[PDB]
C-alpha cells in the first residue's frame, strides 16, 4: 500500500469518556488518543489494517491540558488529539475485548 | 521461551509482541481474571522483557 508513512502507531488508547456508548446511533464511532500528528487519512487507514473495521469518516481535533504543579509554583499543560472516526452498522465489535 | 533468548535473530520479528500479549493489561487485567491464583502477575515478572527486544533492535541499528 502506500503504508509508507507511520501507519505503525498513528492510533492508540481508547477514551471510555462520557461520550462513549452515548455516541452510538447508526454507527459506533471511536475516540482514540491518536498521536498529536496523525492527520485524518492516516487515521482512516490505521483502523483499516488493524481493528479490521470499515471506517466511513474521521474528524479529530486537539484538547489541551494545563495545570500548575511544582516544587513551589510553576506547572504546565499536556496536549492531546481526540479522534471520533465513524465506522458503519453491519459490523459490530465482533470478536474483541471491549474496555 | 521469553527472557534473554535468541539475541542474534537479525531476522527479527519484535512486532505485535506487545499487543498479542496484551491479554492481561488489555483484557485479563480488567476485573478478576488476570491470573487470580494459578499464575497471576506476569508483566513485570517476565513480560517486562519488552525492553530486551526493542533494545536489541535498537542495537542492531548499525546493520
Amino acid at each position: 500500500m502506500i503504508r509508507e508513512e507511520r501507519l505503525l502507531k498513528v492510533l492508540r488508547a481508547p477514551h471510555v469518556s462520557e461520550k462513549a456508548s452515548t455516541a452510538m446511533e447508526k454507527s459506533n464511532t471511536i475516540v482514540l488518543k491518536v498521536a498529536k500528528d496523525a492527520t485524518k487519512a492516516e487515521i482512516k487507514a490505521a483502523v483499516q489494517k488493524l481493528f479490521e473495521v470499515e471506517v466511513e469518516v474521521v474528524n479529530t481535533l486537539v484538547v489541551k491540558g494545563k495545570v500548575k504543579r511544582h516544587g513551589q509554583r510553576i506547572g504546565r499543560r499536556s496536549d492531546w488529539k481526540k479522534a471520533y472516526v465513524t465506522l458503519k452498522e453491519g459490523q459490530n465489535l465482533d470478536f474483541v475485548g471491549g474496555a | 521461551m521469553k527472557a534473554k533468548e535468541l539475541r542474534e535473530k537479525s531476522v527479527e520479528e519484535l512486532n505485535t509482541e506487545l499487543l498479542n500479549l496484551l491479554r492481561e493489561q488489555f483484557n485479563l487485567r480488567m476485573q478478576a481474571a488476570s491470573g487470580q491464583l494459578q499464575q497471576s502477575h506476569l508483566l513485570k515478572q517476565v513480560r517486562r522483557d519488552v525492553a530486551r527486544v526493542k533494545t536489541l533492535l535498537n542495537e542492531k541499528a548499525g546493520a
Binding site: 500548575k68 511544582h70 516544587g71 513551589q72 509554583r73 | -
Partner: protein, 46 residues
Amino acid sequence: MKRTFQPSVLKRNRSHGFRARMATKNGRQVLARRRAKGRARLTVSK
C-alpha cells in the same frame, strides 16, 4: 463610591504579578525567596 481595586486579569502580568517576574534580576529573585525560602504553594497566575 469607587473603592480602590477594579480587577482585570489581562492587567495582571507585565503590569503586575503573573509570569512577568521572570524578566528581572529582582523579579526572578522574588520567586526564589518566595518559593524556596518557606515553601509556598504560591499561586500567582490563575
